[PDB]
Amino acid sequence: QNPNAGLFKQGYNSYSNADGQIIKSIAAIRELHQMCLTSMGPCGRNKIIVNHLGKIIITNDAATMLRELDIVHPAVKVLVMATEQQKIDMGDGTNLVMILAGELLNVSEKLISMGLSAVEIIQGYNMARKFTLKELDEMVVGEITDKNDKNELLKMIKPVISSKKYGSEDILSELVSEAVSHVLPVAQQAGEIPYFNVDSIRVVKIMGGSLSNSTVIKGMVFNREPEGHVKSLSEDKKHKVAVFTCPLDIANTETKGTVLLHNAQEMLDFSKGEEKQIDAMMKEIADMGVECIVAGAGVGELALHYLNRYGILVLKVPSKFELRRLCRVCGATPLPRLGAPTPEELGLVETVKTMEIGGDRVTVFKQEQGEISRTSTIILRGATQNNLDDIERAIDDGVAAVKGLMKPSGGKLLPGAGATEIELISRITKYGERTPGLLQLAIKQFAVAFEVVPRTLAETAGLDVNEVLPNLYAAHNVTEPGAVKTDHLYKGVDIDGESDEGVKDIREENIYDMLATKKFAINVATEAATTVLSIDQIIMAKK
Amino acid sequence: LLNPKAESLRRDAALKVNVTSAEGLQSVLETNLGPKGTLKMLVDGAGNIKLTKDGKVLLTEMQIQSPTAVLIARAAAAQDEITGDGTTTVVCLVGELLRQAHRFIQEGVHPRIITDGFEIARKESMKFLDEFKISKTNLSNDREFLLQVARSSLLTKVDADLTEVLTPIVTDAVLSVYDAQADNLDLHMVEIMQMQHLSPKDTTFIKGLVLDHGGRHPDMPTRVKNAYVLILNVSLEYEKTEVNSGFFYSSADQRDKLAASERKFVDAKLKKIIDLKNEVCGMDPDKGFVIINQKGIDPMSLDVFAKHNILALRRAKRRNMERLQLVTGGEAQNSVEDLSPQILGFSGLVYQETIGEEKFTYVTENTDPKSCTILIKGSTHYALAQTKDAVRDGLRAVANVLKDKNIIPGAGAFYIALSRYLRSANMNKLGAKGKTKTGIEAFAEALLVIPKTLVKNSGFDPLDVLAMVEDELDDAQDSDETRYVGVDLNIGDSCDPTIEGIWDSYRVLRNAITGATGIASNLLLCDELLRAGR
Amino acid sequence: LLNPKAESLRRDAALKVNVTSAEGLQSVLETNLGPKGTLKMLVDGAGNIKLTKDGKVLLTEMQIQSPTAVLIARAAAAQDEITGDGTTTVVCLVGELLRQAHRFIQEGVHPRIITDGFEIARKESMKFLDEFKISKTNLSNDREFLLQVARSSLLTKVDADLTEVLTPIVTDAVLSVYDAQADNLDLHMVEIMQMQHLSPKDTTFIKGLVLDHGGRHPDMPTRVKNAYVLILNVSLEYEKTEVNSGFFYSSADQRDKLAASERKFVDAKLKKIIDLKNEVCGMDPDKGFVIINQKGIDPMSLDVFAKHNILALRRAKRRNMERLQLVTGGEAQNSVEDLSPQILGFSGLVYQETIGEEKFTYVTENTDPKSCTILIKGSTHYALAQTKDAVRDGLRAVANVLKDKNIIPGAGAFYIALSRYLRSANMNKLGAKGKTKTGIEAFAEALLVIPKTLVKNSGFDPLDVLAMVEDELDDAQDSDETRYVGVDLNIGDSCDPTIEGIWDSYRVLRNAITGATGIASNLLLCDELLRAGR
């Protein structure tokens, strides 16, 4: 009997501002904000997601979870796209943008509760965003000069590797710095030409051992074995390397090339002809000076015997991506045909050999003095697959973060451990107090939204926020005998677990954040919050 | 008195249903009116989400169940094909007119009387529109007015931050295509392109055309200054023997020799191309050479071109070649043997842009391209769609303003002034009869919906703003002076639209008023609802 | 925010409930306004059918469930002790004003501003009423104006046919009961009688009093002229002890001896009574003699009086005795021992009325009765009740008009003129506030409910007759002469109330407006409903 009314478009799940849609969307986003809050910080806790393939994946990266989490509410997709943008443009801050957007939308609930309209809230958020972005430029303490030195690189490497397998930085930072130094070319008095390339660094893992057994190899390491009599090249420099696409077998002909067997003598002659053709093809390859052969397809037993007879090393690379990487390392070009390895298409690799790591043989194409390649590989070892995956993700993130040290103020360093957050909170509060009109409340709530970072750092470490946060605020909220603030203004959230109580200056650990990363994260989080708040009606359908 | 498989509305049920549907549609489109309005979120169910504010797009994409709402949306959609804007205004006017008509009908007023009153008020509003408009000058230095119009159009669709970027872009794009002459205006001369993995604020204006395909050789110059544009329809890919042949061999060396011998056909054409390049400004300073080469190019030919400091493209769309024929002035050469300098065009800086997923080429800075390109840049699909919609709306608004010099100040001044003029003149004249006063008052009150909705969206109280506007208008009338009084959605008090820079199109308002009156008359005259065909 | 096991209403629920109750009561009482209104049947569980049109009877004798409606009905009925009429007017005004206030609130107008506007409009309406009233002449010979007032007050309660009989009776009674002196008017001297024998059209005016208790004798006088009135307080009938007792005899001598004790006092009193009758009017021609004898009378003394041509009454009411003393001038004799001719009064025609179920005695035609009596006749309880209510309403209305010389022309002129004056004055002065104009317009529109309801009850369309009246009002205001314009509920066209003879009481209208404004202000200020006490 009870009729339905209020919907004139169609039969669907309708959300309207009259029914509190602005708060329903906020709660829907909170559904994942709660998950993302416990992920940020050095003491972040792991999450497990089961893939459709039956593989159990454990990680602390918010972006990885979002890519796998089943998200159907259209409002959350705004923050998902924000995280995707953070991952694409910046090398870090995937959790930061999510946390900031969630906190902004949460404080928007308080703003609405006071009777403020969404439009004025958005205007105040935009003004506070502009003020915060302008102020961020003044939060720089040090600057990376991009000298490619390991010690200088460690400054940025250490903070990035943190929050993933915390406590293992002593080895991960060294590995990342060594790889970056190996791949980084030598240059000076120029900032227009890019130098770092993330694609030039590859990460591999071998089961067994521990992280202490990891090492870095200058060059590209492959898990494929030669599967031939010759296991490595000689000590001569600049061995000619040939890449083939057609399988190493009897050479064919573009026109005709069809052979039919009917008689037994014909079959015997055909077998002898196949043997002779393989021998002749290998002889022709040798005559061109080819000393190493890369086969993207299968290789016959006769082909192996003949190529080993001429002292030519054969390495199988069936993976197209591995073939591309090898071609980039040595500069060789794949040959679609057999028997025509033109010198112009041949690469140069000084040393090619097979190495045993934990019982698994791997082949590395590397060099020392001549034809230096800017590619490096990081070898990880560990008895636990979950630890190996976590360390691989941490290394990947650390290597990627190096791309942010380029010309556009990439070396700027800001205080970490939330000290920058406290300073920005104070500045935004002052600006809101100065700002007239109702926008002051929006500015104050925007400032409050930045209190999450110390909150998350304290909570993830098992510390009570009610005792950590006020102490940090009191330490930052001090008056100096002068018009300019000075002294220890870099105090942040401590890892705790020792000492007695309170906060410490970050200079002991040298933890700093990137200006570009923080600015981009703030901008994207504010844009996502504005987009979410700008919607007062959502149309959803059964899925 | 009914038939199976059918349902009908009797007595005033049809009127009540139509009024309820109109009110529902108005409330759906009430919140998105004005720069202070909100955005609607649409989900198609396939994973694509659209965040749109334009009324036409919202009505077209959204599914409507109420037949009366469907009719209202379809009728209002005509604004897009006539003026390009005002759909939300039409919907709001229809909704308020139907509200007032239903209120009067509850008092016993026949619908036909209301329809006649609406027609009389429509005639009076047309007279007021004619008397109230402002004539725009034909000066070529009106760029400031065009900027104001573009800002007014954009502020309704953007977040007030991209306005600074889009206003100059739209103004320049519209002005370049339509010179300070009679001639004619065609928005097809302005190309719209979208790029991903870029910031929303990166949107810029390109004087000429942008080519999708880029170079495929590291040695080609990144930038070419004062380049001669060559368009070639002859393929430069590897060619085989003109007569029947093949590759029958025992070793690949014979095949390589045969391929080298056959390459002479392409080599001959490359020689002619290089000769043309050398003859025409081969070594002249501040000169370059660029070849389009619609057809494909063999890598060896690409290397040959690169070694001669020639920037050559390949595999370009025929539409791009046709556009280049005008943008650069060069001609497409069907046969290399007849190649001559007259085919070569001329263009300014030629720049190649490298993107992670693609590579673009710029052929802008032309003497008289008779066209321009706007590059919409964004990182998300919804952002790109919003930017494209805003750019198109601004282009259409500026084109309407240029073609039609009649301009009317906005900011709600027109609606309030029209309402006051009707309330005065119709009541003082009473040209049809007293019984039409109900419809006259209904129309006059309904015409005030737009300013009230704008004030409600801005967050201010409509009562106080309307009272202040009325007080200012009364003071102006008592002073015996001509003054335009509008609504300031940022301060909340009254303001002069002619000074702040808020303007509305004459055609938009005319068509919106006519459509709203027609829809209201058609719906109010519905006596009953009939169902058939089941 | 609620305690466990508690009931309360928040948000706009209180407004919805109040508006619904007010509209329901307004619709219930709408059809009872004007002479063309309808009649309602009431049954208070006893199964008796009662028909009436008086607002007080409808509100008080009908059960109301909604608490807001109960308060509205009580407030409207409270006016009966102040003016005696206007209950339906108060209810209709409250309902329409609340409807308009809710309509404005739906636009965002706060209730307090509406209340302030109502107060301002109330002050303006009081000023308009002061400037609009007409001073009635105090000449006692203005029987025409009194008849017009009585007809106007009566037509609302009767079927428009009994008016020709009842109006003159009520008018004459009210005119006569007022002495030819300043003094004051007192309707307590006007008695109303009900008889179930004849039809309502047979009602007549009685100049004096009517006595219900009388003697019985076949020779009792039927008509007596120029009769002297003697009031006696001593019993003239045989009396027995409190305990049952009697006289028993076995012979004629014992019978006579025992009956002597009973008849001694009766004979002693009769001796002096007959002596007095012989002394005065014993032989005088064209004279009569009537004796009241408040106490009882035995049949022997009744026969004795009859044989002497004396009209003897018995067991008269004390109130009737006092009214006779004030009317006939005769004094009450405590005991016949001091009987004297000075006790005798004087009266005109004295006659008895014989009915199937009872008998009555008339003592009318007195020199200066200083009192009046109205006899109501009918065949059914509901008809008698309706006639009594109409007679009382007419008496009160005429008495109020005589007391207060201020008279307001009716026919709907007052309300239309008040609304027009309010609108014009508030649009010109602009002295209250811009936003208060909302409440001012609400009050102005609400004050037009009464004429609209009157037109609707008559079957005519308000939209036409009210428009014609507005046009006539505009014409009269443009002219330099003073003219009153109203609505003719019988013809449907406009008419002048001062010429046709339709008038409204000044006090009734003033108090109705005040009460309606107060009730509306009180109700519109209710935000939440809280239940407590159990």
mmCIF file of C-alpha atoms in Angstrom, chain C residues 81-83 135-138 142 146 149 174 177-178 182-188 395-407 505-507:
data_model
loop_
_atom_site.group_PDB
_atom_site.id
_atom_site.type_symbol
_atom_site.label_atom_id
_atom_site.label_comp_id
_atom_site.label_asym_id
_atom_site.label_seq_id
_atom_site.Cartn_x
_atom_site.Cartn_y
_atom_site.Cartn_z
ATOM 1 C CA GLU C 81 -19.226 36.873 25.187
ATOM 2 C CA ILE C 82 -17.656 39.943 23.523
ATOM 3 C CA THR C 83 -19.750 40.552 20.385
ATOM 4 C CA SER C 135 -22.469 57.053 12.390
ATOM 5 C CA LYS C 136 -26.063 55.852 12.713
ATOM 6 C CA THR C 137 -28.653 58.431 13.713
ATOM 7 C CA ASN C 138 -29.912 58.153 17.292
ATOM 8 C CA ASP C 142 -35.608 55.124 12.465
ATOM 9 C CA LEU C 146 -33.618 48.733 12.557
ATOM 10 C CA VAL C 149 -30.326 45.459 10.499
ATOM 11 C CA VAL C 174 -36.139 45.431 20.724
ATOM 12 C CA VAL C 177 -38.122 47.128 25.372
ATOM 13 C CA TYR C 178 -35.878 50.221 25.210
ATOM 14 C CA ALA C 182 -30.910 57.432 27.711
ATOM 15 C CA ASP C 183 -30.713 54.720 30.406
ATOM 16 C CA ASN C 184 -29.559 51.488 28.720
ATOM 17 C CA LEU C 185 -30.842 48.386 26.928
ATOM 18 C CA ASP C 186 -31.474 45.105 28.742
ATOM 19 C CA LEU C 187 -32.678 42.054 26.809
ATOM 20 C CA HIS C 188 -33.383 40.186 30.067
ATOM 21 C CA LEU C 395 -32.217 40.466 19.547
ATOM 22 C CA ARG C 396 -28.529 40.722 20.445
ATOM 23 C CA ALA C 397 -27.610 42.290 17.095
ATOM 24 C CA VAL C 398 -30.330 44.946 17.285
ATOM 25 C CA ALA C 399 -29.477 45.694 20.921
ATOM 26 C CA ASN C 400 -25.792 46.102 20.056
ATOM 27 C CA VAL C 401 -26.611 48.367 17.107
ATOM 28 C CA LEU C 402 -28.831 50.533 19.314
ATOM 29 C CA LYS C 403 -26.116 50.708 21.982
ATOM 30 C CA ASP C 404 -23.359 51.429 19.428
ATOM 31 C CA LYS C 405 -24.341 53.899 16.705
ATOM 32 C CA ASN C 406 -21.376 52.801 14.557
ATOM 33 C CA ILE C 407 -22.474 50.639 11.612
ATOM 34 C CA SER C 505 -21.774 45.306 13.250
ATOM 35 C CA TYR C 506 -18.732 47.458 13.988
ATOM 36 C CA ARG C 507 -17.851 45.576 17.176
#
